[PDB]
Amino acid sequence: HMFSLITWNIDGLDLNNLSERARGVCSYLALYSPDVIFLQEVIPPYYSYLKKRSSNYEIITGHEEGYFTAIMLKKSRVKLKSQEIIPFPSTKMMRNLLCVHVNVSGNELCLMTSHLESTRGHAAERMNQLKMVLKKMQEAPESATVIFAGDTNLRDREVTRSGGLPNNIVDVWEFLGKPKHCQYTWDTQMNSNLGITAACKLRFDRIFFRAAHIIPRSLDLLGLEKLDCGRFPSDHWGLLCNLDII
Ligand SMILES: [Mg+2]
């Protein structure tokens, strides 16, 4: 009846206090108990802690070495059907789109995650990767509900310069009337995990939707509380999305 996903860039590259951060993120995931979990910037040790703490989830990794994405499926409700790792072409950061075809209740789904080129890379390649994600979203089978969710790293109206969004694809944040409480997924003013003195408020973590059923209900943020070490679980904010399986 209900349906929930959580997208989070756990910032696994920040090695400081990584144990307590992983314990906190696992506490959030265990508390909300979502059905699908999209994780970005996961390192093998973090993946080992996740697999150790989350046994009721099937974890599909985007790679093996370095950092990668991961998709966790609640085994008690989400039935894995297929998986495909679509690698980006001119990628200078070893990033790819992780697609996982699943079945929830009686509906088919296509859950996609990605971690596009970061701020240090080439914004043009980030736009190209966005076009590849949207194209792979449109070319999905005309029977499943495609749901993308991940750290897009987009800024400076790159969605408009990349040809815009197609007619059958919409941003869940924009669909809900652009709620201002979950307006920014990366805030250097409230989140003090990079030491950036300047206040840069951007919306990196995003969710794209298309259907052939499922309705986005609510949208929220998580990971806003400081841990015992005085740091947040990540430099990005978690993005919780609740849906209704009509
Ligand atoms: Mg990072």
Numbering used by the authors: 112 to 323, 328 to 361
Provide the publication's sentences verbatim.
Tyrosyl-DNA phosphodiesterase 2 (TDP2) {also known as TRAF and TNF receptor-associated gene (TTRAP) or ETS1-associated protein II (EAPII) } is a 5′-tyrosyl DNA phosphodiesterase that can remove the covalently-attached abortive complexes generated by DNA topoisomerase II (TOP2) when it is unable to complete its normal catalytic cycle. Fortunately, this type of DNA lesion is efficiently repaired, in part though the action of TDP2, which hydrolyses the phosphotyrosyl bond in a magnesium cofactor-dependent reaction, leaving ligatable 5′-phosphate moieties. Consequently, TDP2 has attracted interest as a target for small molecule inhibitors that might have utility in overcoming innate or acquired resistance to TOP2 poisons. Using a ‘humanized’ mouse TDP2 expression construct, we have now determined X-ray crystal structures of the catalytic domain of TDP2 in complex with deazaflavin inhibitors, revealing the unusual molecular interactions underpinning their mode of action.
We obtained crystals of the catalytic domain of human TDP2 (hTDP2CAT–residues 113–362), in its unliganded form, using protein expressed in E. coli and purified using standard chromatographic procedures (see ‘Materials and Methods’). However, crystals of hTDP2CAT typically diffracted both poorly and anisotropically. Through iterative screening of many crystals, we were eventually able to collect a dataset that could be truncated isotropically to a maximum resolution of 3.1 Å.
